[PDB]
With several copies, the nearest count.
Chain A
């Protein structure tokens, strides 16, 4: 709010006032010039359409985690918006804001507590954001068409930072394009988007082999064993701040639809994960079967798994499936 308009439906004199801080008070009805000063006063109330309203949105900052000293943890800060720089920030924006400074009063429990604490914010002025199909880009599409070299130069293109293994770097690039399997028309929802799993225990830090592909491939979200486990792989309802609680906070698969689900640490949190892998290999049952709702959303994402062996090396002279614990998920 920036302006006000009270109408009393007797005189029609709309009393204006400046907007102060976040708490204010309406005035009386015997203050005007025409509808006042008699034995009858028009009783005031508000108006919506005659009251111009502005934009407002709140955000919090942290530190770059490279200029932090060796000691303490970084802390937050409060920022505001005005004018029309709104709807132009995002969670995860490595940005900077330029703006002006002012503190604010607290106006609540100011005697016993809240002596002369200040809890300032900064007020924004400018954002200088950073690090962001036949439309002036066709010159590089011709560079693959003229040079050709699909099966080998593109194989050396993705992940050239290993020793050997051109077979497996070729097995993945076909899955990074996918495509609609068949426009079925009738109610025959066919399987698409095959999933390849890996196994073995090299010492070449297998994690940054696969996950380096994921951080350059499109919409392919990283995950691990800790955190978004197989119960929090889908969406759920959780605690929120004092604003609208019981929102549908998600994990990975409700947001990484039709992309890459690059998983590691397959022996971790398997009581929820072993359900979680079948429910996406099964077509279209990513749901929240909780006591809140029984709504079901889509499932269209490929899976790239890397199971770690048992203790020491996987004994090749011994039997396989001594270290993966899911026979029914694998051989069929």
Chain B
């Protein structure tokens, strides 16, 4: 009587993929989306579906949507048998799965006991300690070599190492099996542990956990370390006590009842576990919009005015951080050196001033850019430092917010307060884009190409004026020349600039006064530079001859004598001079480089070198 009931829900599901599920006609939203779900699939060939809980609830008004929570755990092979029936009538190596998503109610892990067996219950949490990718079976064709071993047997359950049902001829059954590797399709999975979220933990009360098997295309999609949701079928698992070498608590007190099966007397216990099907991690004209916006004229000035509302004035520092935000070129000479990938710009200034605002600005604005203070200079982090042996392995790699600035602009402050050992370590991390380590274990060469950005402190808090910055840098000499110029922020106690900055700051912490109009959004600037990165502008003009004279004029200035200053701006700085120059042309989307564009590159460093010189 349940056989036709599952046959009732088979076609009732099938007609749902036959009917419409679309309310709006030709205002977007093309009718009959499930046929499009077939047709997108017959191109890229991924072998999935994606059905929701809304439209099956609002078809039978809960006459079926309440039935399906209590059938599919038993009637897995019913809905999937139906979609096999509908694809032959529609489409022309085929293995599927059923992926529900978006049930309304989301529970926690402490609410799963009685009604939750064979149900569908979305579960939140965070994930830790993944494992690897091995294959499963679900169907074999093993049989005994008694007469003929070509019996495709059934029942690949949790103890499936014995195909022993319905042999082919009148032969000897259950005498052997030969699990060939040649005819039974597999499916790949991994076993992971989850954990409860941080905004729900009542006390520090040893926060409990459970485990979960994910088995479809869900493989390697739960990156460990995020607030994540799940599908919902709950499941129990035994251990059958197979032919392997083995066969506090009163555990299995329930299992003492579970004795006396037809095989040997033991105690088969149980534990609640989880099977998933589908992961999620919550936590045009726009392509034409770029083509209009690329055809503007003042967008160099539009960008520099639209950076961040947390500062007022100082367009000099604003021009720099934009160029750091974009990337330049990195492709270089054949067979040897990879040159610099980018520009690195620091800013010095008095603390508790406008220096902190850019730092607060970029870490939510840049792609995957991280922030550290660098006071933890002896354990790990800044200094890349191997961990001691744990769980069977010594000499493993470590973290540190340095080797994870891949497409990221890491930011780090307060250079004065660390030790002297890292000051050569990051000095190695600056010139070439790799670092090396051979500490107590084999050598390692990790190529972490990076883009640093700093904000240290002056020697007294107040910047000297008549002197040079050679005394107020509070670093050593060669890391200065390894760097570009810092664009030092000055201050003043002026009776006009305070009141306007007061009026500039009061509209900021208004509950709502959003009267300032940046001409660009956060995202439509973000895709704009994503249009900007994908060129490779090359100089071709004769301004190479115009280039070489000005530096040749430049270096004869700061060399004030044979025994004067060793801030001798050497052949390193021609590279930053040209690799700024392709970057600023990557702002205005010009592939050739004019001699007019590098003119403002010069006076960026003319205004820098006067901020160098007294």
* Chain A contacts to B: CB under 8 angstroms: 244-245, 291-292, 294
**B-side contacts of A291, CB under 8 Å:** 206
Q: Are B203 and A294 in contact (CB under 8 A)?
A: yes
- A294 contacts B204, CB within 8 Å? yes
**Can you show 7 pairs from A to B with CB atoms below 8 A apart?**
A244-B248, A245-B248, A291-B206, A292-B206, A294-B203, A294-B204, A294-B205
Question: Residues of A contacting B205 with CB < 8 Å?
Answer: 294
List B residues 179-213 near A (Cβ within 8 Å). 203-206
Nearest 5 pairs of A and B residues by beta carbon: A294-B204, A294-B203, A245-B248, A291-B206, A292-B206
B203: nearest chain-A partner, CB-CB: A294
From residue B3, how far is it (CB to closest CB) to chain A in Å? 36
Residues of the B chain whose Cβ atoms lie less than 8 Å from the Cβ of A294: 203-205
Q: Mark B216-257, 1 if CB is under 8 A from A, else 0.
A: 000000000000000000000000000000001000000000
Chain A residues within an 8 Å CB radius of B248: 244-245
CB closest chain-B residue, reference A294: B204
Chain B residues in contact with chain A, CB under 8 A? 203-206, 248
A contact face: mostly helix, strand, loop, or mixed = loop
Task: Write out the residue numbers on chain B whose beta carbons fall within 8 Å of the beta carbon of A245.
Answer: 248
Give, as a whole number of angstroms, the nearest-CB distance from B213 to chain A.
28
Which chain A residue lies CB-closest to B249? A244
**List of A residues within 8 angstroms of B203 by Cβ:** 294
Please name all residues of chain A whose beta carbon is closer than 8 Å to the beta carbon of B206 when the two chains form the complex. 291-292
Instruction: Specify which chain A residues have a CB less than 8 angstroms from the CB of B204 in the assembled complex.
Output: 294
Determine the residue in chain B with the shortest Cβ distance to A289: B204
A244 to chain B: closest residue by CB: B248
A290 to chain B, nearest CB (A): 10
In the complex, chain B residues whose CB is within 8 Å of the CB of A292: 206
A246 nearest CB neighbor, chain B only:
B248
| Residue ID in chain A nearest B260 by CB atoms | A43
Beta-carbon nearest neighbor of A43 in chain B: B260
Query: How far does the Cβ of B251 sit from chain A's closest Cβ, in whole Å?
Result: 14
| In the complex, residue of chain A having the shortest beta-carbon distance to the beta carbon of B205 | A294
Residue of B nearest to A245 (CB): B248
**How far apart are B565's CB and chain A's nearest CB, in angstroms?**
50
B186 to chain A, nearest CB (A): 41
Which residues on the B side are within 8 Å of A244 (C-beta)? Answer: 248
- Who on chain A is nearest to B204 by CB? A294
Query: Which B residue sits closest to A291, measured CB to CB?
Result: B206
- B267 vs chain A, min Cβ distance (A): 16
Nearest B residue to A292, CB-CB: B206
**Taking the nearest CB of chain B, how far is it from the CB of A288, in angstroms?**
12
Nearest to A242 among chain B residues (CB) is B248
User: How far in angstroms is the closest Cβ of chain B from A289?
Assistant: 9
The smallest C-beta distance from A292 to any residue of chain B, in angstroms, reads 7
Report B257 CB to chain A, min CB distance, Å.
11
**A29 to chain B: closest CB distance in Å?**
12
Closest to A243 in B: B248
CB distance from A25 to the nearest CB of B (A): 13
